[PDB]
Structures are given as structure tokens and as C-alpha cells.
Subunit: 183 residues, 2 copies
């Protein structure tokens, strides 16, 4: 369309972006990138993103945006997934930055750190239905990405009922797609 | 004055926000919070941020914004540290999100443990060579970019530079050797020569 998204199916960060696109009903051309093989290591891919990371959003002819949270912000500007005021927007960024150091993956520290992140999320959701601005934003979608993978990959979340009720809210949003959905 | 910042003097995250406030010439009132003496974990503090996070920016009375990089964004909207186009703004955030998963966890932990926590090297001997390994891979992403760019986003000084500056500037003090990264080092000096620049030891 314009948007070409370089994406990997079973990647939390890539799913975030596909989920936002679906909730936005934004048309895009999708390009599957096989890491756990070689495809994000190639010179041609490194020509687009030096860090060799997926997802990657081609925003202009040969102009690319990396970092899923940044891509989410980009795609949400002026839409229903960005809140209205400067403070509410910052509040969404706050939870997105949190997700980026607290949930995004020395294996103990990450599992322990994620569990404590889960408690922080739980505590907030006790009194709030959504992470920021009292509505669904890109902050809920960012956080959904990996909390979902945990959910969908056997992790015991039974002690986090507020998180579980929030996950259901997201899934019940019109346009929601699961991580193994394809067009 | 306009804002209240809860800040730790020797914290790199806190210093990011102080640097932005100096560069913006923004009037504010500092409240010192010492992480190392458990001071963010008291009832009174947990009341404003339930996660013990410093820095914290009070906007409204009893409304606190956490996360140094979200604070930076908030302070910069409508300022010369914010770029113009939608794409340039998103690139600034791109680099700040990069700082969040690539610098903070490696160069920042290195800084915290090796420079800030008394006898902390011995506490983290297992973590070190990853911090180094992963921090150098980040500095390289930065070097490679700074080859054809003077600033991280939009061709100008933005909050992305300030965010990256926070830990980048203390790396050589914490077991990184920056001699192999001239573009990085030229960038640090460029940031330091911005009018209104303050160092991490400058007091409000």
C-alpha cells in the first residue's frame, strides 16, 4: 500500500505490530522474515536495518522504522489507539518503556523480572481497566504482545486475575487477531 | 516551579531528565531520593509511584509520570528538542526504545554495579561479560549510525541524543573502552557543547 512490514510470525515484537495494524484496519504488504534461519542476517536486510531486527516498517520508499514500540507509536498517531492529551500520551509511553525493560528479554533475572513485572501490572489493573488514559491504547497492545506469549505458552498466570481479565478485554476488541493468525 | 522532580543525583536515568530540563531551561524543583538507602521504598514514596521508580515527574498535584524516557518525551513536546515530522518523531522514539533494551540493561547495569554499588563487582561476576558483550554490540550500532549522521534522529539534537547520552557518557568509567568508537566519541562531545549542557554532578 505504502506500509510494508517485515515480520516474523512467532515473534512477540512482530505480533504487536500486526495486532495494531488489524485493530486499525490498516492495509499493508507483509514480508515474512525467517530468523532461526538466516534472513535478518543478510546484507540486504542489514542494508535496511543495521541491527538486523524484525519487525521493520517500510514507511517511505526505502525509508525504514525499527523498534516495535516505535512502530506502534508511528502507526497510532492521530487514531483511536493514541489518547488525546499530552499527559495521557506520555502515560502510554511510560508503560511502553516499562514493557521494554521489564518484559522484553541471566535467564533467571528475566523470568524473575517478568514475574515482578506481572505483579506491577496486576496491581495497576486492580483499579484500572487499561494501562493508560482510561481507554485502550498502544500501551495495552505493547504489553499484550509478550504477556500473551506467556499466556499461550503454558505460564501460570492464575495469581494475576486482573491481568487475565485485561487480556480478555484486549481479545474482545473488534479486529483482534491472535499471534498465529495469518490473512 | 513548573514541575517537581524526584531524582537521584548519581542515577543515569535521573540525570537524563535533569539534562533535558537544563537544555530546555525549564524551571523545576528537585526532591532528592537515594535508591541505595531504600528511600524509594517507603510508604510515603510508594504512594506516588507503587514501583519505587526514580525519576518521577509530578505534573498535576498527585499525578506522577515515571520512566525517564517517557518523562523526556513529555517535556519535549512543542520544544526545539522535538522534531517536526511524524517520521522524525518516530525515529527519536526508535532510538529511545533502543536505549531502553540495549543500553540500560547492559551499560546501565555495568554503571550501577561497577560504579555505584559499594563492592558491587563481586556481586555480579557472572553478569559482566554479557554486559560488555551486549553493550559493545549497542555502541557499534551507535558507531555505525554516527558514521553518516551527527545526531541520532532528524539531523538535530533531540531527546533521543539526551537519552543515549545518559549511560553512553559513563561507559568508559565502567569497563568499556571507547577508543575504538570515534564517531561515538565525537557525538558525546557534540552533546556536551550544546548550550546549557550540565554534567551529572551539577546540582539543582
Amino acid at each position: 500500500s505504502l506500509y510494508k512490514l517485515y515480520s516474523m510470525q512467532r515473534s512477540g515484537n512482530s505480533y504487536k505490530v500486526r495486532l495494531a495494524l488489524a485493530l486499525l484496519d490498516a492495509p499493508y504488504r507483509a514480508v515474512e522474515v525467517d530468523i532461526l534461519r538466516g534472513e535478518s542476517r543478510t546484507p540486504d536486510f542489514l542494508a535496511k536495518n543495521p541491527s538486523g531486527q524484525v519487525p521493520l516498517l517500510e514507511t517511505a520508499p526505502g525509508r525504514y522504522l525499527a523498534e516495535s514500540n516505535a512502530i506502534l507509536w508511528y502507526l497510532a498517531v492521530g487514531t483511536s489507539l493514541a489518547p488525546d492529551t499530552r499527559m495521557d500520551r506520555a502515560e502510554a509511553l511510560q508503560w511502553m518503556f516499562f514493557e521494554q525493560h521489564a518484559l522484553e528479554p541471566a535467564l533467571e533475572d528475566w523470568l524473575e523480572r517478568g514475574y515482578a513485572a506481572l505483579q506491577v501490572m496486576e496491581n495497576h489493573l486492580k483499579t484500572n481497566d487499561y494501562f493508560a488514559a482510561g481507554q485502550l491504547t498502544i500501551a495495552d497492545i505493547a504489553l499484550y504482545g509478550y504477556t500473551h506469549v506467556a499466556d499461550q505458552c503454558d505460564f501460570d498466570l492464575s495469581t494475576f486475575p486482573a491481568v487475565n481479565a485485561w487480556l480478555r478485554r484486549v481479545e474482545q476488541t473488534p479486529g483482534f487477531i491472535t499471534m498465529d493468525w495469518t490473512p
